[PDB]
């Protein structure tokens, strides 16, 4: 909080204005605490939109330093907002976390071969990449700021990419990448997975998700979770007989 003020002091009669607008927004959020999370999210998103535009207009600041200060804004606001807006009791975030956790647990038997995962864990360097990717996705929940949660997803993906490139000696396509990320998520069963996804969607500076790499990897995480939710015998090229046997928890593939 002290660092945010010192940071903004740098920007003269543009830093004071941002600080005022940030404080106004945060005061607005306090008076919206008893509204729906959708309404709280629209407020933050409007705020991101409006502070960015009011910088291009009545501020004349280079787009290089504009992203850098939006990162500082996001960190200040979300550090303060996290306790209130992450997994709120008025939502089904907890319910969704438990259901995905239970679902991922149910699917503990699914092998990389079933998912046609292009990684060979018998190569020690590949095994090390997989271990790191699982830790990256697990760490997501330990970070409070959406940008830092996104960085865990992105780190996880690049460790996955290394695992695939070492195994295959070709750069991963989406067809290679997505089943590997699904597999990593199944092995990691990352804590509060839906709450993390919802929080990023609701409160991340909307820009970072639009075109750039963090947006791509986050989208892929969303695809992984959606695939896991609806996964059936046909998904894994299994007969219903085998799928049902594995699902019972009584049989090893």
């Amino acid at each position: 909080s002290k660092e945010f003020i010192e940071f903004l002091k740098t920007f003269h009669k543009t830093g004071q204005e941002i600080y005022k607008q940030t404080k106004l927004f945060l005061e607005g959020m306090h008076y919206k605490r008893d509204l729906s999370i959708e309404e709280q999210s629209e407020c933050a998103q409007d705020f991101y939109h409006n502070v960015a535009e009011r910088m291009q207009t009545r501020g004349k600041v280079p787009p290089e330093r504009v992203e850098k200060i939006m990162d500082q804004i996001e960190k200040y606001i979300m550090t303060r907002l996290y306790k209130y807006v992450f997994c709120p009791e008025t939502t089904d975030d907890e319910k969704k976390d438990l259901a995905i956790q239970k679902r991922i647990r149910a699917l503990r038997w699914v092998t990389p071969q079933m998912l046609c995962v292009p990684v060979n864990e018998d190569i020690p360097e590949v095994s090390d990449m997989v271990v790191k990717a699982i830790t990256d996705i697990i760490e997501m929940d330990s970070k409070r700021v959406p940008r830092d949660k996104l960085a865990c997803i992105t780190k996880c993906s690049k460790h996955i990419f290394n695992a695939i490139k070492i195994t295959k000696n070709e750069p991963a396509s989406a067809d290679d990448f997505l089943p590997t990320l699904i597999y990593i998520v199944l092995k990691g069963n990352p804590p509060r997975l839906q709450s993390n996804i919802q929080y990023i969607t609701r409160f991340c500076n909307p820009s970072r998700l639009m075109t750039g790499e963090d947006g791509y990897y986050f989208t892929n995480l969303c695809c992984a979770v959606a695939f896991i939710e609806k996964l059936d015998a046909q998904s894994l090229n299994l007969s219903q007989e085998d799928f049902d046997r594995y699902m019972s928890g009584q049989t090893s593939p």
Binding site: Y216, F227, S235
Partner: protein
């Protein structure tokens, strides 16, 4: 000033990856970028590869959300690959937002001796859905530059 999201559609076997690598030691080929200048206007291009396997069919929309353009690759020797494009176009056209700029790309024109999808069918299909059709050969590095250049032009318009 312009930043564009472009989704890449097709299974691996239609040669989509060679095509985008041609254009853009490489670690990965799933997320790819190009910085362009068009009529003295600056363009940030992000290519988002999407998983083409049938098992991932329901996931498309998650990927396609807020795309500015789409590159749908088929293999001119495989009429089934062309049928897949037509279904993808239907999905892309149900995405909430502005009209996504579509490219329908007939790849492996170096195998025109063995083609199963006629040029007339492909071009006439493209026109019918407000798309543009392009011929490429990743193998012989033809048509690739023209495709991306034209798409950005179209996405600016």
């Amino acid at each position: 000033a312009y930043s564009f999201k472009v989704v890449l559609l097709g299974e691996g076997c239609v040669g989509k990856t060679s095509l985008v690598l041609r254009y853009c030691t490489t670690l990965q080929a799933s997320f790819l970028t190009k910085k362009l200048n068009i009529g003295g206007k600056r363009v940030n291009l992000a290519i988002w590869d999407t998983a083409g396997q049938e098992r991932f069919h329901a996931l498309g929309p998650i990927y396609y959300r807020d795309s500015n353009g789409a590159i749908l690759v088929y293999d001119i020797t495989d009429e089934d690959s062309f049928q897949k494009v037509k279904n993808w176009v239907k999905e892309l056209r149900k995405m909430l937002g502005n009209e996504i700029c579509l490219c329908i790309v007939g790849n492996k024109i170096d195998l025109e001796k063995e083609r199963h999808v006629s040029i007339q069918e492909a071009e006439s299909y493209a026109e019918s859905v407000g798309a543009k059709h392009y011929h490429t050969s990743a193998k012989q590095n033809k048509g690739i530059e023209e495709l991306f250049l034209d798409l950005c032009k179209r996405m600016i318009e």
